[PDB]
Amino acid sequence: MRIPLVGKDSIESKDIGFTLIHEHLRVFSEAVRQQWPHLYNEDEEFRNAVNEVKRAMQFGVKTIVDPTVMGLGRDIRFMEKVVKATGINLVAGTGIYIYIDLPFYFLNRSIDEIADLFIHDIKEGIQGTLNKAGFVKIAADEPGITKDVEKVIRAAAIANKETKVPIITHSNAHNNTGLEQQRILTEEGVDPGKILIGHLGDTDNIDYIKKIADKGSFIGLDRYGLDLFLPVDKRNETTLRLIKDGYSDKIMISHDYCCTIDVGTAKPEYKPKLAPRWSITLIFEDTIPFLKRNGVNEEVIATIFKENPKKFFS
Amino acid sequence: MRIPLVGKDSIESKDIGFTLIHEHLRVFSEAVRQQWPHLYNEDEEFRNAVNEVKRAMQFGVKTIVDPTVMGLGRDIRFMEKVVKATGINLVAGTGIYIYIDLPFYFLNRSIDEIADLFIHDIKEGIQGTLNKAGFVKIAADEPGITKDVEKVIRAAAIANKETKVPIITHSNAHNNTGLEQQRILTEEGVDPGKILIGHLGDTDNIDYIKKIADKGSFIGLDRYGLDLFLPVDKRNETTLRLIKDGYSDKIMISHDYCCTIDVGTAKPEYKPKLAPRWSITLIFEDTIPFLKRNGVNEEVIATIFKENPKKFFS
Ligand SMILES: [Co+2]
Ligand SMILES: [Co+2]
Ligand SMILES: [Fe+2]
Ligand SMILES: [Fe+2]
């Protein structure tokens, strides 16, 4: 009816339920896996993804939004297996994930051409399947808004205006990229309430986070567990403050957890260093209980994990 | 017994025959093709490659060296089908093709880890097959010698010293990257005579070219047909001058032709002006006939397309 699901019939937003807005079933570099497949283990990746999703469902997680796209190794078929194995509601997306330049393929390609790719995934289907994308993902990091990163941003705007699917972003909390993303998108006619500025939970700077929420976009406190960016307790302080300041209407919380990720930084011997208890359920284990014993009632929790996702997708 | 061939028993370097040292059966962005396969057509690509290679064999070509690696869309299985259909001697390689940064996978990974990937393709095989790489390909362009670009160059060095295979590079003829690639490789202990500094035919600055050759490396006048880099006539004038000054034993000539390329710059609309008569048989139609009628004997032609490739793979 509204929100497309992987390996399932579309559902109305009122059916989305308790959602984790930013989680990855699996992440890898398309090029390396294609060129050195001996580096990967399809079987193990599947076990880890199925196990995480099951544990999350045991906590009452009803729907999981996965922002894995070009550049992160999106694969609907793999996502489709995980769905059959768990019965989870999985929202797949489209888009391009880059930090500096686009693949050489886009050399001399218009912004419209890029947009046509997103729209294709949205209206036609993903990677040859009839599984449709329910949102579009774009990114920017340390390098800032480069010429190509902007191409992609604009392309997203075009897709959104044509399909009305929301936009989720990856940004660097310390260099105003998120703010710039929101600025460019809203200028292109994109409803701020259809944007989720991501990874804002990576900083203490409350003024900056409110600045973006005030503009009318959702704020992503979406890396709980990734201590290397910001410890759990400090994220909790921030999240609590935002809540006490009445910003639940714009808050979205998730882990950005990678059930499997090929990045050299995700090596086991580093897990303890700056990502000890990083998982897809840390939120039920630590964050929510912390907020509850700190005044935050159940209705605020529902707003964040149910209402917000619902508005975002309607 | 010396040079590995795709879908064939390795051959002595002495049996290499007339060789095109730099041609591409197919080129594409892994990430793009993987996320939007609807943009590509197997059949077309296969026919184009088969047709080109056949015409090339009708002109006396025995061996084609295809430097399509990671980033360029390497695919030995596609390469095998072509060999089975043409019977051509095809040399596949390993390496990485970047201008700026490495895929995220390499974040926090040593140069040694990268080298192990090349050594894997050379010793073990490519993409789960027993076809082995005969060389390593590296690149550098406008951005110059970035940190990740340099990490690849040093990785290639390690591979060479371990496996003995030669190194083909891609460079920018105007930014000095070619000479940089040479300095680093030699400093790492790589034999200059086992390096091919490519795309030097894009410039008519003979001084810079002679310098690279004086330092013992092969010079690649390998883009005949690509007028957008440098018209055929100016390339021919350079080639001829170099030969007159006695650089035949360092000169290697090719088209760098892509039987099919996904890049928007290679659109059939921009072909009449960026590369009018650009194919894998252009040198037989223009370059070679030009050199001959200009005082270049069969001996020198044989040195460039037969002796130099032989030496390079020894
Ligand atoms: Co992100
Ligand atoms: Co090249
Ligand atoms: Fe993410
Ligand atoms: Fe090339």
Residue numbers in the entry:
A (entry chain A), B (entry chain C): 1 to 314
From the publication, what sentences describe this entry?
PLLs are natural lactonases endowed with promiscuous phosphotriesterase activity. The catalytic center contained two metal cations coordinated by four histidines, an aspartic acid and a carboxylated lysine residue. A structural analysis of SsoPox, a hyperthermostable counterpart of the PLL family from Sulfolobus solfataricus, has revealed that loop 7 is shorter in SsoPox than in PTEs; linking the active site to the loop 8, which forms a hydrophobic channel that accommodates AHLs aliphatic chain. Indeed, W263 is located at the start of loop 8, involved in the dimer interface of the enzyme and positions the lactone cycle of the substrate onto the bi-metallic catalytic center.
A single mutation of W263 can significantly increase the paraoxonase activity of the enzyme (by 23-fold with the W263F substitution), the oxo-lactonase activity (by 148-fold with the W263T substitution) and the activity toward the poor AHL substrate (3-oxo-C12 AHL; by 55-fold (W263V)). However, whereas detergent-induced flexibility has no effect on the lactonase activity, we isolated variants of W263 that exhibit increased lactonase activities (W263T/V/I). These variants exhibit dramatic improvement of their oxo-lactonase catalytic efficiencies (148-fold for variant W263T), while the activity for the best AHL substrate is compromised (3-oxo-C10 AHL; for the wild-type enzyme). Conversely, the LacSV group dramatically increases oxo-lactonase activity and 3-oxo-C12 AHLase activities, while the phosphotriesterase activity is mildly modulated and 3-oxo-C10 AHLase is decreased. The residues selected in the LacSV group (T, V, I) are overall smaller than those selected in the PteSV group (F, L, M) with the exception of isoleucine (I). Mutations W263V-T therefore yield enlarged active site cavities for the lactone variants. Notably, contrary to the wild-type enzyme, all selected variants (with the exception of W263F) exhibit a substrate inhibition for undecanoic-δ-lactones with KI values ranging between 789 ± 186 µM and 7 400 ± 2 475 µM, respectively, for the W263V and W263M variants. Indeed, all variants exhibit a lower Tm compared to the wild-type enzyme (between 92.0 ± 2.1 °C for SsoPox-W263L to 84.1 ± 1.6 °C for SsoPox-W263V). The analysis of the normalized B-factors of the variants clearly reveal that the substitution W263 is destabilizing (as confirmed by the Tm of the variants), but also that the active site loops of PteSV are significantly more disordered than those of LacSV. PteSV lose their activity before the loss of the global structure (Tm), whereas LacSV do not, and exhibit a similar thermophilicity profile to that of the wild-type enzyme.
